[PDB]
Amino acid sequence: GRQFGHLTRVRHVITYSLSPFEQRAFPHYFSKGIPNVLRRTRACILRVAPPFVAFYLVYTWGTQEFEKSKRKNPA
Amino acid sequence: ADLTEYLSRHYKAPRMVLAAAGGLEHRQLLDLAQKHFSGLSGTYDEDAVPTLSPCRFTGSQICHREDGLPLAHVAIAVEGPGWAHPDNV
């Protein structure tokens, strides 16, 4: 039930925009793009990766332990 | 010095027009023009005199958002042709 012209109050803010036909869709796509993804990765790796390596270690150990347990030796 | 440089470069005889309308003969308008304007570009026709160059129109938006003002102003335009063009009519 929310409409433009009724959302909120904003004062003293200028927005400059260009037409889509004046500008490139892929402005500096690799030159600026790659540096950004690396920066985004660095920012989040310590938050995202360590639970999944913790999954990976419990996976690797668990599969190994199950394999070894269904072998005998001195009996 | 900025101001006199502007005056020197721009207020030059081939670039200005003495216009009149009303109860006058053209002859006396011409007479007064030689009387009072003739010391302007008799040998002052010199320096880079002064080409305009085309202006690139864009296609773009400027939005000064001020909700403290009680009415919105909006102006919208496509690129027109210059003074010369028959398309104006």
Side-chain angles (χ1 to χ4, degrees), chain A residues 3-60:
Chain A
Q3 324 120 88
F4 287 101
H6 278 328
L7 301 164
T8 193
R9 177 184 182 80
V10 175
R11 309 193 58 182
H12 320 307
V13 180
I14 308 164
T15 303
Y16 311 96
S17 280
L18 234 74
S19 177
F21 295 94
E22 289 299 318
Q23 61 176 304
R24 345 165 153 251
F26 306 94
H28 271 106
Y29 188 62
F30 303 106
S31 342
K32 271 157 139 79
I34 311 154
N36 252 320
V37 29
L38 309 148
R39 188 197 53 72
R40 303 218 256 139
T41 311
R42 219 180 299 125
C44 87
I45 39 110
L46 294 183
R47 295 104 180 266
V48 191
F52 292 119
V53 239
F55 164 81
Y56 177 73
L57 300 160
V58 181
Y59 171 83
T60 306

Short mmCIF file of all heavy atoms in Angstrom, two decimals, chain A residues 3-60:
data_model
loop_
_atom_site.label_atom_id
_atom_site.label_comp_id
_atom_site.label_asym_id
_atom_site.label_seq_id
_atom_site.Cartn_x
_atom_site.Cartn_y
_atom_site.Cartn_z
N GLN A 3 3.30 4.13 -1.89
CA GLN A 3 3.40 4.77 -3.23
C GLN A 3 4.45 5.86 -3.22
O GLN A 3 4.58 6.59 -2.23
CB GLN A 3 2.05 5.39 -3.70
CG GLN A 3 0.77 4.65 -3.34
CD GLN A 3 -0.17 5.50 -2.49
OE1 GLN A 3 -1.01 6.25 -3.03
NE2 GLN A 3 0.01 5.44 -1.17
N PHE A 4 5.14 6.03 -4.35
CA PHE A 4 6.01 7.19 -4.59
C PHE A 4 5.24 8.50 -4.42
O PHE A 4 4.13 8.63 -4.92
CB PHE A 4 6.63 7.12 -5.99
CG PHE A 4 7.69 6.09 -6.14
CD1 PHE A 4 7.40 4.86 -6.75
CD2 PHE A 4 9.03 6.35 -5.71
CE1 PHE A 4 8.41 3.87 -6.91
CE2 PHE A 4 10.05 5.39 -5.91
CZ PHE A 4 9.73 4.14 -6.51
N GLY A 5 5.86 9.46 -3.74
CA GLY A 5 5.19 10.68 -3.30
C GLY A 5 4.62 10.60 -1.88
O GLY A 5 4.17 11.61 -1.36
N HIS A 6 4.60 9.40 -1.29
CA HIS A 6 4.09 9.18 0.08
C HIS A 6 5.03 8.42 1.01
O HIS A 6 4.66 8.14 2.16
CB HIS A 6 2.73 8.46 0.06
CG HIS A 6 1.56 9.37 -0.19
ND1 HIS A 6 1.52 10.68 0.25
CD2 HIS A 6 0.38 9.14 -0.79
CE1 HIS A 6 0.38 11.23 -0.13
NE2 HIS A 6 -0.33 10.32 -0.77
N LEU A 7 6.26 8.14 0.55
CA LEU A 7 7.17 7.22 1.26
C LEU A 7 7.77 7.85 2.50
O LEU A 7 7.39 7.49 3.60
CB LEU A 7 8.25 6.62 0.34
CG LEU A 7 7.79 5.80 -0.89
CD1 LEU A 7 8.94 5.62 -1.87
CD2 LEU A 7 7.18 4.45 -0.51
N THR A 8 8.64 8.84 2.31
CA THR A 8 9.32 9.57 3.40
C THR A 8 9.71 11.03 3.00
O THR A 8 9.48 11.46 1.85
CB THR A 8 10.56 8.74 3.90
OG1 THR A 8 11.04 9.28 5.13
CG2 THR A 8 11.77 8.88 2.92
N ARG A 9 10.31 11.76 3.94
CA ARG A 9 10.76 13.14 3.75
C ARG A 9 12.29 13.20 3.52
O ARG A 9 13.08 12.67 4.33
CB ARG A 9 10.33 13.96 4.97
CG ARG A 9 10.75 15.41 5.00
CD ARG A 9 10.37 16.10 6.30
NE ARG A 9 10.72 17.52 6.32
CZ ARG A 9 10.03 18.52 5.74
NH1 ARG A 9 8.93 18.27 5.00
NH2 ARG A 9 10.46 19.76 5.86
N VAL A 10 12.68 13.83 2.41
CA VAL A 10 14.09 14.02 2.05
C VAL A 10 14.27 15.46 1.57
O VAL A 10 13.51 15.93 0.70
CB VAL A 10 14.56 12.99 0.91
CG1 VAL A 10 16.02 13.28 0.43
CG2 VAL A 10 14.45 11.56 1.39
N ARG A 11 15.31 16.11 2.08
CA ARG A 11 15.66 17.49 1.73
C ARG A 11 17.15 17.58 1.39
O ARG A 11 18.00 17.00 2.10
CB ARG A 11 15.37 18.45 2.90
CG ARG A 11 13.95 18.37 3.54
CD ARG A 11 13.62 19.52 4.48
NE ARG A 11 13.72 20.82 3.79
CZ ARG A 11 13.53 22.02 4.35
NH1 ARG A 11 13.26 22.16 5.64
NH2 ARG A 11 13.62 23.10 3.60
N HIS A 12 17.47 18.40 0.39
CA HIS A 12 18.85 18.91 0.11
C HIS A 12 19.80 17.89 -0.57
O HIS A 12 21.03 18.01 -0.46
CB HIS A 12 19.51 19.57 1.34
CG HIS A 12 18.60 20.42 2.16
ND1 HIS A 12 17.84 21.44 1.62
CD2 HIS A 12 18.33 20.42 3.49
CE1 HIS A 12 17.16 22.04 2.58
NE2 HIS A 12 17.46 21.45 3.73
N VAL A 13 19.23 16.98 -1.37
CA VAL A 13 19.98 15.89 -2.00
C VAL A 13 19.79 15.95 -3.52
O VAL A 13 18.67 15.83 -4.03
CB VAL A 13 19.56 14.48 -1.42
CG1 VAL A 13 20.35 13.33 -2.10
CG2 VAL A 13 19.80 14.42 0.12
N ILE A 14 20.91 16.16 -4.23
CA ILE A 14 20.93 16.22 -5.70
C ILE A 14 21.43 14.89 -6.27
O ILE A 14 22.36 14.31 -5.74
CB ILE A 14 21.80 17.44 -6.20
CG1 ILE A 14 21.33 18.75 -5.52
CG2 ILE A 14 21.70 17.59 -7.76
CD1 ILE A 14 22.28 19.89 -5.63
N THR A 15 20.69 14.36 -7.25
CA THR A 15 21.06 13.14 -7.98
C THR A 15 21.28 13.43 -9.47
O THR A 15 20.36 13.86 -10.21
CB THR A 15 19.97 12.03 -7.81
OG1 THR A 15 19.79 11.75 -6.41
CG2 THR A 15 20.43 10.71 -8.38
N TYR A 16 22.51 13.18 -9.91
CA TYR A 16 22.88 13.26 -11.31
C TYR A 16 22.81 11.86 -11.93
O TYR A 16 23.32 10.90 -11.36
CB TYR A 16 24.28 13.85 -11.46
CG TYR A 16 24.52 15.12 -10.67
CD1 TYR A 16 25.13 15.08 -9.39
CD2 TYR A 16 24.18 16.39 -11.20
CE1 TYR A 16 25.39 16.27 -8.65
CE2 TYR A 16 24.44 17.60 -10.47
CZ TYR A 16 25.04 17.52 -9.21
OH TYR A 16 25.32 18.67 -8.51
N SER A 17 22.06 11.73 -13.03
CA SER A 17 21.91 10.46 -13.74
C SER A 17 22.21 10.66 -15.20
O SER A 17 22.00 11.75 -15.72
CB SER A 17 20.50 9.88 -13.57
OG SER A 17 20.34 9.23 -12.33
N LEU A 18 22.70 9.60 -15.85
CA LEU A 18 22.85 9.56 -17.30
C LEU A 18 21.92 8.55 -17.95
O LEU A 18 21.58 7.52 -17.33
CB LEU A 18 24.31 9.26 -17.67
CG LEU A 18 24.98 10.25 -18.60
CD1 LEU A 18 25.29 11.54 -17.86
CD2 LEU A 18 26.24 9.65 -19.16
N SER A 19 21.47 8.88 -19.16
CA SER A 19 20.74 7.96 -20.04
C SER A 19 21.52 6.65 -20.29
O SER A 19 22.75 6.70 -20.46
CB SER A 19 20.44 8.63 -21.38
OG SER A 19 19.79 7.75 -22.27
N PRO A 20 20.81 5.49 -20.38
CA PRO A 20 21.43 4.20 -20.74
C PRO A 20 22.12 4.21 -22.10
O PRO A 20 22.93 3.33 -22.35
CB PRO A 20 20.22 3.25 -20.83
CG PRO A 20 19.18 3.87 -20.09
CD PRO A 20 19.35 5.33 -20.18
N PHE A 21 21.68 5.09 -22.99
CA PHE A 21 22.16 5.15 -24.36
C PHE A 21 23.37 6.09 -24.48
O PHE A 21 23.98 6.20 -25.54
CB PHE A 21 21.03 5.61 -25.28
CG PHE A 21 19.87 4.63 -25.37
CD1 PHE A 21 18.75 4.76 -24.52
CD2 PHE A 21 19.87 3.61 -26.35
CE1 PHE A 21 17.64 3.87 -24.63
CE2 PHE A 21 18.77 2.71 -26.46
CZ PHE A 21 17.66 2.85 -25.58
N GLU A 22 23.68 6.78 -23.38
CA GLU A 22 24.85 7.67 -23.27
C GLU A 22 26.09 6.95 -22.70
O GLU A 22 27.22 7.43 -22.86
CB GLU A 22 24.51 8.89 -22.42
CG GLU A 22 23.55 9.89 -23.06
CD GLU A 22 24.06 10.51 -24.37
OE1 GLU A 22 25.26 10.87 -24.45
OE2 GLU A 22 23.23 10.68 -25.29
N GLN A 23 25.87 5.78 -22.11
CA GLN A 23 26.85 5.13 -21.24
C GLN A 23 27.00 3.60 -21.51
O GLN A 23 26.13 2.98 -22.16
CB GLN A 23 26.58 5.45 -19.76
CG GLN A 23 25.24 4.99 -19.22
CD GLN A 23 25.07 5.25 -17.73
OE1 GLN A 23 25.90 4.80 -16.92
NE2 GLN A 23 23.97 5.88 -17.36
N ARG A 24 28.15 3.04 -21.09
CA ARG A 24 28.44 1.61 -21.29
C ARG A 24 27.82 0.76 -20.23
O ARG A 24 27.83 1.12 -19.05
CB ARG A 24 29.95 1.28 -21.43
CG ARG A 24 30.92 2.43 -21.69
CD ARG A 24 32.38 2.04 -21.43
NE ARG A 24 33.32 2.83 -22.21
CZ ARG A 24 34.05 2.38 -23.26
NH1 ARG A 24 33.93 1.12 -23.69
NH2 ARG A 24 34.89 3.20 -23.87
N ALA A 25 27.30 -0.39 -20.65
CA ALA A 25 26.77 -1.43 -19.75
C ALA A 25 27.88 -2.12 -18.92
O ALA A 25 27.65 -2.53 -17.77
CB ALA A 25 25.97 -2.46 -20.54
N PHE A 26 29.07 -2.24 -19.52
CA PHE A 26 30.24 -2.85 -18.86
C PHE A 26 31.40 -1.83 -18.85
O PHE A 26 32.30 -1.91 -19.70
CB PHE A 26 30.63 -4.17 -19.56
CG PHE A 26 29.49 -5.15 -19.68
CD1 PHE A 26 28.71 -5.21 -20.87
CD2 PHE A 26 29.21 -6.06 -18.64
CE1 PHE A 26 27.64 -6.14 -21.00
CE2 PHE A 26 28.15 -7.00 -18.75
CZ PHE A 26 27.36 -7.04 -19.93
N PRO A 27 31.32 -0.82 -17.94
CA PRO A 27 32.12 0.42 -18.06
C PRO A 27 33.63 0.16 -18.02
O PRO A 27 34.33 0.48 -19.02
CB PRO A 27 31.66 1.25 -16.85
CG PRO A 27 30.34 0.67 -16.46
CD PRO A 27 30.45 -0.79 -16.74
N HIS A 28 34.10 -0.51 -16.96
CA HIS A 28 35.48 -0.98 -16.86
C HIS A 28 35.46 -2.36 -16.19
O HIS A 28 35.77 -2.50 -14.99
CB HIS A 28 36.35 0.04 -16.09
CG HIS A 28 36.96 1.09 -16.97
ND1 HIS A 28 36.51 2.39 -17.00
CD2 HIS A 28 37.97 1.02 -17.87
CE1 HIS A 28 37.21 3.08 -17.88
NE2 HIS A 28 38.11 2.28 -18.42
N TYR A 29 35.00 -3.35 -16.96
CA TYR A 29 34.38 -4.57 -16.42
C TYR A 29 35.36 -5.50 -15.69
O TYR A 29 35.04 -6.01 -14.61
CB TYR A 29 33.61 -5.35 -17.51
CG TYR A 29 32.78 -6.52 -16.98
CD1 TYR A 29 31.73 -6.32 -16.06
CD2 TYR A 29 33.07 -7.84 -17.39
CE1 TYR A 29 30.96 -7.41 -15.56
CE2 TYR A 29 32.31 -8.95 -16.88
CZ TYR A 29 31.25 -8.71 -15.97
OH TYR A 29 30.51 -9.75 -15.48
N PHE A 30 36.54 -5.71 -16.29
CA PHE A 30 37.60 -6.53 -15.67
C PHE A 30 38.58 -5.70 -14.83
O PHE A 30 38.95 -6.12 -13.72
CB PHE A 30 38.34 -7.37 -16.73
CG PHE A 30 37.44 -8.29 -17.53
CD1 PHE A 30 37.12 -7.99 -18.88
CD2 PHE A 30 36.89 -9.47 -16.94
CE1 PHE A 30 36.27 -8.84 -19.63
CE2 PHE A 30 36.05 -10.33 -17.68
CZ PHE A 30 35.74 -10.02 -19.04
N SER A 31 38.94 -4.51 -15.33
CA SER A 31 39.91 -3.60 -14.68
C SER A 31 39.51 -3.19 -13.25
O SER A 31 40.37 -3.13 -12.36
CB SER A 31 40.14 -2.34 -15.54
OG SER A 31 39.73 -2.52 -16.89
N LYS A 32 38.21 -2.93 -13.05
CA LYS A 32 37.65 -2.59 -11.73
C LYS A 32 36.91 -3.76 -11.06
O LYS A 32 36.86 -3.84 -9.82
CB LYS A 32 36.73 -1.39 -11.83
CG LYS A 32 37.43 -0.08 -11.67
CD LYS A 32 36.64 1.05 -12.32
CE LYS A 32 36.64 2.31 -11.45
NZ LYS A 32 37.92 3.09 -11.59
N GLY A 33 36.39 -4.68 -11.89
CA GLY A 33 35.57 -5.79 -11.43
C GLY A 33 36.32 -6.82 -10.60
O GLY A 33 35.88 -7.12 -9.48
N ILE A 34 37.41 -7.37 -11.15
CA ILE A 34 38.31 -8.29 -10.42
C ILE A 34 38.81 -7.74 -9.03
O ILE A 34 38.52 -8.39 -8.02
CB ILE A 34 39.49 -8.91 -11.33
CG1 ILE A 34 38.95 -9.49 -12.65
CG2 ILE A 34 40.27 -10.02 -10.55
CD1 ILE A 34 39.98 -9.52 -13.83
N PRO A 35 39.44 -6.52 -8.97
CA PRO A 35 39.84 -5.93 -7.67
C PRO A 35 38.73 -5.91 -6.61
O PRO A 35 39.02 -6.18 -5.43
CB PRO A 35 40.23 -4.50 -8.04
CG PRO A 35 40.75 -4.62 -9.41
CD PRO A 35 39.90 -5.66 -10.09
N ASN A 36 37.49 -5.72 -7.06
CA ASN A 36 36.32 -5.69 -6.18
C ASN A 36 35.98 -7.04 -5.58
O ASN A 36 35.88 -7.14 -4.36
CB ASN A 36 35.10 -5.09 -6.89
CG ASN A 36 34.74 -3.69 -6.38
OD1 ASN A 36 34.79 -3.41 -5.17
ND2 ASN A 36 34.33 -2.83 -7.30
N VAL A 37 35.86 -8.08 -6.42
CA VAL A 37 35.53 -9.47 -5.96
C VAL A 37 36.52 -10.01 -4.94
O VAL A 37 36.11 -10.48 -3.88
CB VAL A 37 35.18 -10.52 -7.14
CG1 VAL A 37 35.87 -10.20 -8.43
CG2 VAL A 37 35.49 -11.99 -6.73
N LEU A 38 37.81 -9.80 -5.20
CA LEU A 38 38.88 -10.10 -4.24
C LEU A 38 38.70 -9.36 -2.89
O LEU A 38 38.74 -10.00 -1.83
CB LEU A 38 40.28 -9.83 -4.85
CG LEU A 38 40.62 -10.46 -6.23
CD1 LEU A 38 41.57 -9.57 -7.01
CD2 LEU A 38 41.19 -11.88 -6.10
N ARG A 39 38.37 -8.06 -2.97
CA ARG A 39 38.07 -7.22 -1.79
C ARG A 39 36.85 -7.74 -1.00
O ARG A 39 36.89 -7.81 0.25
CB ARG A 39 37.88 -5.74 -2.20
CG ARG A 39 37.75 -4.73 -1.02
CD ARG A 39 37.16 -3.33 -1.39
NE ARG A 39 35.86 -3.40 -2.10
CZ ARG A 39 34.68 -3.74 -1.55
NH1 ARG A 39 34.58 -4.05 -0.25
NH2 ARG A 39 33.59 -3.77 -2.31
N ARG A 40 35.79 -8.13 -1.73
CA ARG A 40 34.57 -8.71 -1.14
C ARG A 40 34.85 -10.07 -0.49
O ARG A 40 34.32 -10.37 0.58
CB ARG A 40 33.46 -8.85 -2.19
CG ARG A 40 33.05 -7.57 -2.90
CD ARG A 40 31.58 -7.48 -3.17
NE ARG A 40 31.21 -7.73 -4.56
CZ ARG A 40 30.15 -8.44 -4.97
NH1 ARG A 40 29.36 -9.07 -4.10
NH2 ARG A 40 29.91 -8.57 -6.26
N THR A 41 35.72 -10.87 -1.14
CA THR A 41 36.15 -12.20 -0.66
C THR A 41 36.93 -12.10 0.67
O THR A 41 36.54 -12.73 1.67
CB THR A 41 37.01 -12.93 -1.76
OG1 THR A 41 36.32 -12.85 -3.01
CG2 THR A 41 37.11 -14.45 -1.51
N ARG A 42 38.00 -11.27 0.67
CA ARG A 42 38.82 -10.91 1.86
C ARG A 42 37.97 -10.49 3.07
O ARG A 42 38.16 -11.00 4.20
CB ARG A 42 39.76 -9.75 1.48
CG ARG A 42 41.16 -9.83 2.06
CD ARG A 42 42.07 -8.65 1.67
NE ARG A 42 42.27 -8.56 0.21
CZ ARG A 42 42.02 -7.48 -0.54
NH1 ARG A 42 41.58 -6.34 0.01
NH2 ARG A 42 42.22 -7.53 -1.86
N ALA A 43 36.97 -9.63 2.79
CA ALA A 43 36.00 -9.11 3.76
C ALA A 43 35.20 -10.20 4.48
O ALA A 43 34.92 -10.07 5.69
CB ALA A 43 35.05 -8.13 3.07
N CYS A 44 34.89 -11.30 3.78
CA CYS A 44 33.95 -12.31 4.28
C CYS A 44 34.51 -13.73 4.55
O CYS A 44 33.84 -14.53 5.22
CB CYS A 44 32.70 -12.39 3.38
SG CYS A 44 32.88 -13.50 1.97
N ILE A 45 35.70 -14.06 3.98
CA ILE A 45 36.31 -15.42 4.10
C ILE A 45 36.41 -15.98 5.52
O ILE A 45 36.15 -17.17 5.72
CB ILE A 45 37.72 -15.55 3.41
CG1 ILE A 45 38.58 -14.30 3.61
CG2 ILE A 45 37.59 -15.97 1.96
CD1 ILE A 45 39.76 -14.52 4.53
N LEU A 46 36.77 -15.13 6.48
CA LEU A 46 36.92 -15.53 7.88
C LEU A 46 35.59 -15.82 8.57
O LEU A 46 35.53 -16.56 9.55
CB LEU A 46 37.75 -14.50 8.67
CG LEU A 46 39.25 -14.30 8.32
CD1 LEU A 46 39.91 -13.29 9.27
CD2 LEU A 46 40.09 -15.62 8.25
N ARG A 47 34.50 -15.29 7.99
CA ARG A 47 33.14 -15.52 8.49
C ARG A 47 32.47 -16.71 7.84
O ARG A 47 31.75 -17.46 8.53
CB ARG A 47 32.28 -14.26 8.32
CG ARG A 47 32.74 -13.07 9.14
CD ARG A 47 33.46 -12.02 8.33
NE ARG A 47 33.87 -10.89 9.16
CZ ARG A 47 33.18 -9.77 9.33
NH1 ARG A 47 32.01 -9.58 8.72
NH2 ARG A 47 33.67 -8.82 10.10
N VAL A 48 32.72 -16.91 6.53
CA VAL A 48 32.04 -17.97 5.73
C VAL A 48 32.81 -19.31 5.74
O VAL A 48 32.22 -20.36 6.07
CB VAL A 48 31.67 -17.51 4.25
CG1 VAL A 48 30.75 -18.52 3.57
CG2 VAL A 48 31.02 -16.16 4.23
N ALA A 49 34.12 -19.27 5.45
CA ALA A 49 34.93 -20.51 5.24
C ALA A 49 35.16 -21.47 6.46
O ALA A 49 34.96 -22.68 6.30
CB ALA A 49 36.25 -20.22 4.48
N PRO A 50 35.56 -20.96 7.66
CA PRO A 50 35.90 -21.85 8.80
C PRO A 50 34.83 -22.88 9.29
O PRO A 50 35.30 -23.91 9.76
CB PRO A 50 36.29 -20.87 9.92
CG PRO A 50 36.80 -19.71 9.21
CD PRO A 50 35.88 -19.56 8.01
N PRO A 51 33.50 -22.63 9.24
CA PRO A 51 32.53 -23.71 9.45
C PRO A 51 32.57 -24.81 8.39
O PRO A 51 32.35 -25.97 8.75
CB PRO A 51 31.18 -22.98 9.41
CG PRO A 51 31.49 -21.62 9.84
CD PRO A 51 32.82 -21.31 9.22
N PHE A 52 32.84 -24.45 7.12
CA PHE A 52 32.85 -25.41 6.00
C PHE A 52 34.10 -26.30 5.93
O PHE A 52 34.00 -27.49 5.54
CB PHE A 52 32.63 -24.71 4.66
CG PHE A 52 31.24 -24.14 4.49
CD1 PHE A 52 31.06 -22.75 4.30
CD2 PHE A 52 30.09 -24.99 4.46
CE1 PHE A 52 29.75 -22.20 4.11
CE2 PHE A 52 28.79 -24.45 4.28
CZ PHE A 52 28.63 -23.04 4.11
N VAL A 53 35.28 -25.73 6.26
CA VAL A 53 36.45 -26.57 6.59
C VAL A 53 36.22 -27.45 7.81
O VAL A 53 36.57 -28.63 7.78
CB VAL A 53 37.86 -25.82 6.69
CG1 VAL A 53 38.85 -26.42 5.69
CG2 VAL A 53 37.76 -24.32 6.50
N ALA A 54 35.57 -26.91 8.85
CA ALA A 54 35.12 -27.71 9.99
C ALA A 54 34.13 -28.85 9.61
O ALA A 54 34.26 -29.96 10.14
CB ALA A 54 34.55 -26.84 11.11
N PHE A 55 33.24 -28.60 8.63
CA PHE A 55 32.49 -29.69 7.98
C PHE A 55 33.43 -30.67 7.26
O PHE A 55 33.27 -31.88 7.39
CB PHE A 55 31.39 -29.17 7.01
CG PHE A 55 30.87 -30.23 6.03
CD1 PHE A 55 29.90 -31.18 6.44
CD2 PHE A 55 31.42 -30.34 4.72
CE1 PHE A 55 29.45 -32.21 5.56
CE2 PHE A 55 31.01 -31.40 3.83
CZ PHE A 55 30.02 -32.33 4.25
N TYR A 56 34.34 -30.12 6.44
CA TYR A 56 35.29 -30.91 5.63
C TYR A 56 36.18 -31.88 6.47
O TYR A 56 36.39 -33.03 6.06
CB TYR A 56 36.17 -29.98 4.75
CG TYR A 56 37.22 -30.71 3.95
CD1 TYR A 56 36.86 -31.50 2.83
CD2 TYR A 56 38.58 -30.70 4.35
CE1 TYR A 56 37.83 -32.25 2.11
CE2 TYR A 56 39.56 -31.44 3.64
CZ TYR A 56 39.17 -32.22 2.52
OH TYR A 56 40.10 -32.94 1.82
N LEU A 57 36.69 -31.40 7.60
CA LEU A 57 37.50 -32.22 8.51
C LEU A 57 36.71 -33.36 9.15
O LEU A 57 37.19 -34.51 9.17
CB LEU A 57 38.19 -31.36 9.60
CG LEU A 57 39.18 -30.24 9.20
CD1 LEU A 57 39.36 -29.23 10.34
CD2 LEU A 57 40.53 -30.78 8.73
N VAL A 58 35.49 -33.06 9.61
CA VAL A 58 34.58 -34.06 10.21
C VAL A 58 34.07 -35.07 9.14
O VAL A 58 33.91 -36.27 9.43
CB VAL A 58 33.37 -33.38 10.98
CG1 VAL A 58 32.44 -34.42 11.61
CG2 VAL A 58 33.88 -32.43 12.09
N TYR A 59 33.90 -34.58 7.89
CA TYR A 59 33.61 -35.44 6.72
C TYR A 59 34.74 -36.43 6.44
O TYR A 59 34.48 -37.64 6.26
CB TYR A 59 33.34 -34.59 5.46
CG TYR A 59 33.26 -35.38 4.16
CD1 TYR A 59 32.05 -36.02 3.78
CD2 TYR A 59 34.37 -35.44 3.27
CE1 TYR A 59 31.95 -36.74 2.55
CE2 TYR A 59 34.29 -36.18 2.05
CZ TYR A 59 33.08 -36.82 1.69
OH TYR A 59 32.98 -37.51 0.51
N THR A 60 35.97 -35.90 6.31
CA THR A 60 37.14 -36.68 5.92
C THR A 60 37.46 -37.73 6.99
O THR A 60 37.52 -38.92 6.67
CB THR A 60 38.35 -35.74 5.63
OG1 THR A 60 37.96 -34.74 4.67
CG2 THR A 60 39.51 -36.49 4.93
#
